Design a protein around this ligand. Structure first.
Ligand SMILES: [Mg+2]
Ligand SMILES: [Zn+2]
Ligand SMILES: [Zn+2]
Lengths: 900, 55, 76, 93
DNA sequence: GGAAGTAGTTACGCCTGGTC
DNA sequence: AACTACTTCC
RNA sequence: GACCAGGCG
């Protein structure tokens, strides 16, 4: 067997079309009355057969097995190919009318040939040189080789060549160039002149651009379906070919009979229009060929180009077999690299497994079970290639005749590798390989930590599941695409697979100050997390009743590597003095006395020493979508299996903590005392008074413009600054008064979910609403709503919502908030469309670039793009947050390893 | 000699494909193991007959 | 007085000798057509005596590797 | 506030300034300078590229990724660059 | 250099129904 | 429509 | 089979 090494593109010669054809088509009909194809028609059986029961006259194959064969239509008068129209015009105006030479000087000929031989690798230089030669020839009036006037050639839209000659003394006339004389002009062009025109002497010929024989695409390339009504629905190509044959027959009849030249020219133009619309219906400046219904026909050009065309719709991307799709549901109790597959999908989709020495018994059992029982099989393929569906009265015999070397398409079972994909597919983590785990109900299951790579949020999301079928594909998936890898994002060199909301909040509830757990809770959480353990550590405290209690830090430390040691400040740092004291203690010797650290322990300073958590609370900094310090260190220093084990264990542990400890959000989470409410009220009152003063100053001309903008823009910017500062101050008051024991605050300060802005808008004023960065202005003249005096520029009248969500919005504020939400929702779709187009452009530009074995990055033709990838040779996925190596981390780690 | 990810994937895939067509397993494997898992066990043990060539 | 090489954006350029150019081409097993190109009308080229067909070594001053040498051929 | 590695930006800029001039990333730039005919025809303008390639008789050496996907042959990237050799006599332990 | 014309694109799936 | 980029008459 | 409309993430 061979593989395609290269494809040379050329223009088919008339003799090539005549020889390649299996029939010459003469009759403009498709089928007879009885339903059989008309001999000599567009559906002649010598071009292949598509209707079942028919037989091909060229191959002898049935429908769906005959590939299809070409036919030709000997045109009575040659026509102009629309695709090569501009090329023909350029060649015509760059070559002589009588001899056909390029009308260039011999010295210019040799110099331009030498420059053509050079700079051929890149298309742009060759194109520019061709344009220069075209300009030089076009300007010239007399052919240097033979003395002859060269009348200028005008070109309208397609296939209209119109050169202008001086009919009389001082009077010029435009003479239309019929395809016959144009083609003859093109044949007179010599072969030594073609390269300077850009044409290939062998694979192309300018005369072949004027086509006198039209190839007819095979029947299999334009199938016709019989409707349930009993009528026949033909393809657009079939209709266009029928019209072309009819008009060609009319032209041939008028030519052999003899007709006035005007009628012949009209029929010739009709045939040319038919051919042009056949090749490209949406060609510039041509009436599209419309269907009988009224829609335009889809022709060859429409068959190729477009998002629904051949290239994008059936070559780059195409529908595949052995795929499944259903809604996804959460499942924290499966590993990060596993997926829950419904029994229906597992029974439907199959994995072809060739029976060998070791899996003979299992395949025999699953053949015995058959397509009904889940651990069964659907098909059995003998070594000869004959396939047999498993059914009753077959299971026993096929199980007996399994032997060795046969193929058995078995059901999905636990451990099988599949591709899981939620397909807005932006980065390479949108498809990862998961291990199959068969589940009862009919929905896909996904671990929560793997949501961030897929951007899935269990609100109706659906994901596609593809089953690789060849052993090479299965190995490729299981080695390169498994979910254990890709924990670190290639984008920023940080953890993308980590805890999201409940893991972070439960970790904080676990490791925070004063959080203790009873013996039963500790044993249950350790068993739930999957941590292997045969003895509990010594308890930290003792209850008033003498019951032993464990600290959350000890429980968390039970699942850390015994060598890990790191310190950092997380988001819970509100008093930097305590963090500075801890850092000062650490810097003196790098191995502080554990009790001394426990004396100065703080929630805002995480300090792990030999795998024991001595200070700090679990935050988004421990593990998260970005900046997971502990997870990054575990995945970079201990491997990728250890990272997966730690991730699974910590997710289950935190889930147990948050479930059995209680985590809720109520109305009281947005409550503020009377003092905080009064402070916020005074904040808004002062802001409104300041805005009023600014407005009054601007009305009296008292205010003067800021640099770079006018008076109106100065006033607008000052007002927005004042309003934003007022919102910030009210949010600061709310932050001061709400406290850290509020669950809504807890999940916001720890990064689990929500920002400070949400709490500010929910417990204090909503703040100023804006569209496109400006204050609300769209509405009536001088106002937004008809409930405000025209010409009002005040805070409330322009979108400043003074109410919280808890306090409820007034109707005006409700409309203003609706405007803000509308602008956001409108922004989303435009942004996603623009980003998608830009990503497509970037991918199509940078697809093939790769790192060679010498370390360089090279273009497909061998051009060196980078002599060392990233200018240092480090992959961003393997880098330390963009750094080549974390020097300080390595130094501290080694010093603690040896001196410890 | 350290294999890259792609070299490891190609070696394991070729070995699994060979095993699926009757090439004897070079080690002892548990019954019921799929050919891909047998190839992965072979690679993890270290008995790798396939050698990658580099420019 | 002001040369474009004193600009912080512009890295230092230098023309390689024939021996160094041959060593470079042998090192990466490439032809001059396989190198990135710099126009002969480029200000950095004109500030030097470079002529078409010549190789320029650029001390790029990378943020990731400190220094990094990049090579460009001169074309018309 | 988006964090992207510097190396990706360097790769894009170096590919954009590989011809001695700053050229776009679209159909009139880096993509338009691709040697493969089918790769260019797959992106945006398709009939124009195919017709002009047939005019000049361009050859598609199939050295890239896109065209090898279109035809259904291994792409020369990742596992597609690995050449394997094997000594025939295998002796199980 | 205009000053118009002309052409070329404008995310990815998936589902439902209804008419040709 | 609304952008770009050519092209191409001026 | 392609056209329209409505939704889903
Ligand atoms: Mg969703
Ligand atoms: Zn046939
Ligand atoms: Zn002449």
């Amino acid at each position: 067997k061979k593989v395609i090494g290269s494809i040379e593109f050329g223009i088919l010669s008339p003799q090539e079309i005549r020889k390649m054809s299996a029939v010459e088509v003469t009759v403009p009909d498709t089928y007879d009355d009885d339903g059989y194809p008309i001999e000599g028609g567009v559906m002649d059986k010598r071009m292949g057969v598509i209707d079942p029961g028919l037989r091909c006259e060229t191959c002898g194959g049935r429908a769906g097995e005959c590939p299809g064969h070409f036919g030709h239509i000997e045109l009575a008068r040659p026509v102009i190919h629309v695709g090569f129209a501009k090329t023909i015009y350029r060649i015509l105006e760059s070559t002589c009318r009588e001899c056909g030479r390029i009308k260039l000087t011999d010295e210019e000929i040799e110099e331009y040939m030498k420059k053509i031989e050079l700079a051929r690798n890149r298309r742009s230089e060759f194109n520019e040189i061709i344009k220069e030669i075209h300009k030089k020839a076009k300007e010239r009036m007399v052919c240097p080789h033979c003395g002859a006037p060269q009348y200028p050639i005008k070109f309208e839209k397609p296939t209209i060549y119109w050169e202008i000659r001086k009919d009389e003394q001082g009077n010029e006339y435009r003479h239309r160039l019929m395809p016959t004389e144009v083609r003859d002009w093109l044949e007179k062009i010599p072969d030594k002149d073609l390269p300077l025109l850009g044409l290939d002497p062998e694979k192309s010929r300018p005369e072949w651009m004027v086509l006198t024989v039209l190839p007819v695409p095979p029947v299999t390339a334009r199938p016709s379906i019989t409707l349930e009504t009993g009528i026949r629905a033909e393809d657009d190509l079939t209709h266009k070919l029928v019209d072309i044959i009819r008009i060609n027959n009319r032209l041939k009849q008028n030519i052999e009979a003899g007709a006035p030249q005007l009628i012949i020219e009209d029929l010739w133009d009709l045939l040319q229009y038919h051919v042009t619309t056949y090749i490209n219906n949406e060609a510039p400046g041509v009436p599209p060929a419309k269907h009988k219904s009224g829609r335009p026909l889809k022709t060859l050009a429409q068959r190729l180009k477009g998002k629904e065309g051949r290239f994008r719709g059936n070559l780059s991307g195409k529908r595949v077999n052995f795929s499944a799709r259903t809604v996804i549901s959460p499942d924290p109790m499966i590993s990060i690299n596993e997926v829950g597959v419904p029994v229906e999908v597992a029974m439907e989709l199959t994995v072809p497994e060739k029976v060998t020495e070791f899996n003979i018994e299992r395949l025999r059992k699953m053949v015995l079970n058959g397509p009904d029982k889940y651990p069964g099989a659907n098909y059995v393929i003998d070594p000869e290639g004959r396939r047999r569906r498993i059914m009753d009265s077959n299971k026993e015999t096929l199980a007996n005749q399994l032997d060795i070397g046969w193929t058995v398409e078995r059901h999905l079972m636990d451990g099988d590798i599949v591709l899981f994909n939620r397909q807005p597919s932006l980065h390479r983590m949108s498809i990862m390989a998961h291990r199959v785990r068969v589940m009862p109900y009919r929905t896909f299951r996904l671990n929560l930590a793997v949501c961030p790579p897929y951007n899935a949020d269990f609100d109706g999301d659906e994901m596609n599941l593809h089953v690789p079928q060849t052993e090479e594909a299965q190995a490729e998936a299981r080695i390169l695409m498994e979910v254990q890898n890709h924990i670190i994002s290639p984008r920023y060199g940080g953890p993308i697979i980590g805890g999201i909301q409940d893991h972070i909040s439960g970790g904080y509830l676990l490791t925070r100050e004063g959080a203790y757990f009873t013996r039963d809770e500790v044993e249950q959480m350790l068993m739930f997390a999957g941590v292997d353990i045969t003895e509990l550590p010594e308890p930290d405290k003792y209850d008033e009743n003498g019951n032993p209690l464990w600290s959350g830090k000890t429980i968390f430390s039970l699942l850390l590597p015994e060598d890990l040691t790191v310190w950092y400040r997380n988001k819970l740092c509100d008093e930097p003095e305590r963090c500075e004291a801890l850092e000062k203690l650490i810097e003196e010797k790098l191995m502080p006395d554990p009790e001394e650290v426990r004396k100065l322990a703080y929630d805002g300073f995480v300090y792990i020493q030999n795998g024991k958590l001595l200070s700090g609370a679990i935050d988004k900094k421990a593990y998260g979508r970005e900046d997971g310090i502990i997870l990054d260190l575990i995945v970079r220093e201990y491997g990728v299996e250890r990272a997966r084990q730690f991730l699974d264990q910590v997710t289950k542990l935190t889930i147990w903590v948050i479930t059995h400890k209680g985590f809720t959000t109520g109305i009281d989470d947005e409550d503020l005392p009377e003092e905080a409410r009064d402070r916020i009220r005074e904040i808004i009152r002062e802001a409104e008074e300041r805005v009023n003063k600014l407005i009054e100053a601007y009305k009296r001309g008292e205010l003067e413009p800021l640099p770079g903008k006018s008076l109106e823009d100065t006033l607008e910017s000052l007002i927005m600054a004042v309003l934003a500062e007022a919102r910030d101050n009210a949010g600061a008051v709310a932050e001061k008064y709400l406290g850290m024991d509020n669950h809504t605050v807890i999940m916001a300060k720890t990064g689990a979910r929500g920002k400070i802005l949400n709490i500010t808008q929910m417990a204090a004023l909503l703040g100023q609403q804006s569209i496109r960065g400006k204050r609300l202005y769209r509405g009536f003249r001088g106002r937004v709503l008809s409930h405000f005096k025209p010409g009002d520029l005040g805070a409330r009248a322009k979108g400043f919502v003074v109410n919280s969500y808890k306090s409820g919005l007034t109707p005006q504020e409700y409309f203003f908030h609706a405007m803000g939400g509308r602008e956001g929702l409108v922004d989303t779709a435009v942004r996603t469309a623009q980003s998608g187009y830009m990503q497509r452009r970037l991918i199509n530009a940078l697809q093939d670039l790769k790192v060679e074995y010498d370390g360089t990055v090279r273009s497909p033709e061998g051009i060196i793009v980078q002599f060392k990838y990233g200018e240092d040779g480090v992959d961003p996925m393997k880098s330390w947050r963009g750094k080549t190596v974390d020097v300080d981390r390595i130094i501290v780690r080694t010093l603690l390893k040896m001196r410890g | 000699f350290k294999y890259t990810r792609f070299e490891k994937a190609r070696i394991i895939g070729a070995r699994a494909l060979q095993i699926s067509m009757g090439a004897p397993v070079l080690i002892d494997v548990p019954p019921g193991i799929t050919p891909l898992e047998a190839a992965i066990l072979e690679f993890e043990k270290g008995v790798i007959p396939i050698t990658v060539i580099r420019p | 007085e002001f040369s474009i090489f004193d600009h912080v954006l512009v890295p230092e350029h230098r023309v390689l000798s024939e021996e160094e150019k041959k060593a470079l081409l042998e090192k990466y097993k490439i032809t001059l057509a396989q190198l990135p190109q710099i126009k002969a009308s480029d200000p950095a080229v004109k500030a030097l005596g470079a002529k078409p067909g010549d190789v320029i070594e650029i001390k790029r001053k990378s943020p990731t590797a400190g220094v990094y040498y990049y090579y460009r051929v001169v074309v018309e | 506030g988006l964090e992207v590695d510097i190396r990706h930006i360097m790769l894009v800029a170096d590919m954009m300034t590989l011809d001695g001039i700053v050229r776009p990333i679209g159909r009139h730039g880096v993509v338009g300078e691709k040697s493969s005919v089918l790769a260019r025809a797959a992106f945006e303008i398709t009939v124009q590229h195919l017709f002009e390639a047939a005019e000049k008789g361009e050859v598609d050496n199939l050295n890239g990724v896109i065209e090898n996907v279109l035809i259904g042959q291994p792409v020369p990237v990742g596992t597609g660059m690995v050449k394997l050799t094997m000594k025939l006599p295998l002796r199980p332990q």
